[PDB]
Design an enzyme around this catalytic site. Sequence first.
Site, short mmCIF file in Angstrom:
data_model
loop_
_atom_site.label_atom_id
_atom_site.label_comp_id
_atom_site.label_asym_id
_atom_site.label_seq_id
_atom_site.Cartn_x
_atom_site.Cartn_y
_atom_site.Cartn_z
N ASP A 125 -73.12 4.48 79.48
CA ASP A 125 -72.30 4.10 78.34
C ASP A 125 -73.11 3.48 77.21
O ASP A 125 -72.55 3.06 76.20
CB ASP A 125 -71.18 3.16 78.77
CG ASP A 125 -70.37 3.71 79.94
OD1 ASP A 125 -70.11 4.93 79.97
OD2 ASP A 125 -70.01 2.91 80.83
N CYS A 183 -71.51 -3.28 84.14
CA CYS A 183 -71.30 -2.69 82.83
C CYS A 183 -69.83 -2.84 82.46
O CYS A 183 -68.97 -2.22 83.08
CB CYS A 183 -71.70 -1.22 82.82
SG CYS A 183 -71.06 -0.26 81.40
N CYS A 208 -67.86 0.97 82.34
CA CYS A 208 -67.57 1.62 83.61
C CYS A 208 -67.35 0.64 84.75
O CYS A 208 -66.96 1.03 85.85
CB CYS A 208 -68.68 2.61 83.96
SG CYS A 208 -70.34 1.87 84.07
N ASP A 223 -79.66 -31.65 88.93
CA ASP A 223 -80.27 -30.33 88.83
C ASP A 223 -79.50 -29.31 89.67
O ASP A 223 -79.91 -28.99 90.79
CB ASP A 223 -81.73 -30.36 89.26
CG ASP A 223 -82.44 -29.04 89.02
OD1 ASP A 223 -81.79 -28.12 88.48
OD2 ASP A 223 -83.63 -28.92 89.39
N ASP A 270 -79.54 -35.92 84.88
CA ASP A 270 -78.68 -34.76 84.98
C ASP A 270 -78.92 -34.13 86.35
O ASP A 270 -80.04 -33.78 86.68
CB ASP A 270 -79.02 -33.78 83.84
CG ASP A 270 -78.16 -32.53 83.87
OD1 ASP A 270 -77.52 -32.25 84.92
OD2 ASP A 270 -78.09 -31.82 82.83
N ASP A 289 -83.04 -33.27 87.22
CA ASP A 289 -83.96 -32.46 86.44
C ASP A 289 -84.72 -33.53 85.67
O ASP A 289 -84.18 -34.12 84.71
CB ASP A 289 -83.20 -31.57 85.46
CG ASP A 289 -84.14 -30.65 84.65
OD1 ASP A 289 -85.37 -30.67 84.88
OD2 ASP A 289 -83.65 -29.96 83.74
ZN LIG Z 1 -71.41 1.88 82.35
#
Ligand SMILES: [Zn+2]
Lengths: 327, 207
Positions: free
Chosen positions: A129, A114, A117, A101, A99, A233
């Site tokens: 929030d 967030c 907001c 890496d 695989d 990997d």
């Molecule tokens: Zn926020």
Amino acid sequence: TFTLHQGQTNLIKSFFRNYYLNAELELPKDMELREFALQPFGSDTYVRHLSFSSSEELRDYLVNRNLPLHLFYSSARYQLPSARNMEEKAWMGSDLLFDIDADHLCKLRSIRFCPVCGNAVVSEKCERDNVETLEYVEMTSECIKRGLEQTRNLVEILEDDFGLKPKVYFSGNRGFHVQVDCYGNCALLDSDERKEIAEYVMGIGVPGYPGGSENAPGWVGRKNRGINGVTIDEQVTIDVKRLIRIPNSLHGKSGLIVKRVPNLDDFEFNETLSPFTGYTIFLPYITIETEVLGSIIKLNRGIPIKIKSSIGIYLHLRNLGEVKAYV
Amino acid sequence: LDVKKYPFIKSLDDELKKYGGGITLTDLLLNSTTLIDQAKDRIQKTKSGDELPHYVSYNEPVLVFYTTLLSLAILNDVKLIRRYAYAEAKQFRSLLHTENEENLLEISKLLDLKINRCDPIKFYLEKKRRIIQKEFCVHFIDYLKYTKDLKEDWKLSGQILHKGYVYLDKNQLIGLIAESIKSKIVEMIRPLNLKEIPEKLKSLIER
Ligand SMILES: [Zn+2]
């Protein structure tokens, strides 16, 4: 008093369901001997120790019982795929895996904000929030090219040196996975012997070959050809018990198919790696400008957008907004 | 192939045949004078840590071989059995370093190594400031088996594999053969420890 209380149905799960409903997964013949696992939506923990013996059995479980956000199957072949104790399971061979890496290879840009907001937070929760912050990792085509290189070199070492017949597959998200369906005495290679091959392919103990012609046959030529070791990997390779994300499954972090690349040269990182059709109304969490499926997209927090399903699902699973509707 | 040099080649029972029927090693041992002592010496030359004499220097090499094994068996010194097999294999190495190609290839087959000849590969090495070439190749799967408990020098990474096969030079091939021999010995001691021996023979080999 007249506020409508109606929850937005998860369309994503719809898309997936529809997909798996008709998708034709690439399954081993020795299906009955492999343990299947699956990470469901809204659950971080896997639903392991499953065992089917028909594409249909598997299909029904997905579409009816549990829908996989991520779907795999052990590389290892057992006698009791469903057993719970290693001693009962009875390992009797495991496929050879490699695989690229991508973590080491690319070094991609991530962001924490967030969803409310739409501001950047460093912590995992937004005090203002009182909501958990999200993270977005911009996956570029520059990086996909880097992986396609190593995959090229890998297939070389695999075919040229070991005389094997590798099969390349798009990881479904950040890179590629090469696999040799060896069933011979190969399938019994101990983890340590596997670790040998891993270091060989990684160019670990390999010396440089200062003189050597580009036409030498092994690291001798290779080294003199610019190649100084494949970036894989090892853990994947050295691990006798490992989960092979089933070819043709959808990658929970992209909604992209785990497609098989037959010609590394033709491989293009488009929205064509997504089985989905129509269009979707997307509602961005944040105003951002980033490359998405090999194209820059400008997003403004709040402003809905009518994009292709492919990008829609993609951007959604990547935490940039929500797929509010479908067309 | 010289059984005089590579005793292990010949079966003990095939050797015992030329002495009569139902002839048992102990029977010869009990009546032979030189044998037990020749063994005792070998076990000493190692117990001390001195070069072991090639088997051709003996009158009854094969019989001496199996006798030193049977003695090691009776002695019950894992440390010695191991110490011996190392010194022993070392000795056989020296012999091989002068052996023919076809001959080297035969001991391998006998020793159960899947090494064969193949269209040799040549390439410019910088240490020799000249082109080097390997003609012996084992299949990578086996090679990993054979080298499982060896040193870093054998690590597949420092190797030269092409089209599934790991290419080797004479010196390498030998070291590989030397290795199986070292093990062959530890294994050859078991079938002797099998049956019961005469108290008289025991005490003789113990002094
Ligand atoms: Zn926020």
